[PDB]
């Protein structure tokens, strides 16, 4: 049904830059994106469901 396909180019990248680093050293663990999970555990604590 078709010949030429469209394909994404780049890989993804997970770097520890930011507060997610400190926990790797100090806390001894890491979370994939903690710059978000860390965020939405604040707003959720306020707004709604």
């Amino acid at each position: 049904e078709d010949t030429e396909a469209d394909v994404p180019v780049t890989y993804g990248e997970m770097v520890l830059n930011g507060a997610n680093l400190v926990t790797a050293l100090v806390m001894g663990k890491a979370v994939r994106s903690l710059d978000d999970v860390g965020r939405h555990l604040l707003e959720m604590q306020e707004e709604q469901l």
């Binding site: 979370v31 994939r32 994106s33 978000d36 999970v37 939405h40 555990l41 959720m44």
Partner: protein
């Protein structure tokens, strides 16, 4: 065995949805920490 239970605070904010739905317990051995709950449970909190 070291099956640490998953982290509910993180799983409260998922990265992406699953798609297919199946009885999961049918095949366990793919997983490590596996838990069933009936409608709610005390340790979740």
């Amino acid at each position: 065995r070291d099956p640490p239970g998953y982290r509910y605070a993180a799983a409260m904010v998922p990265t992406g949805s699953i798609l297919s739905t199946i009885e999961v317990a049918s095949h366990r051995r793919l997983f490590d920490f596996f838990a069933r709950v009936r409608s709610d449970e005390n340790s979740l909190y």
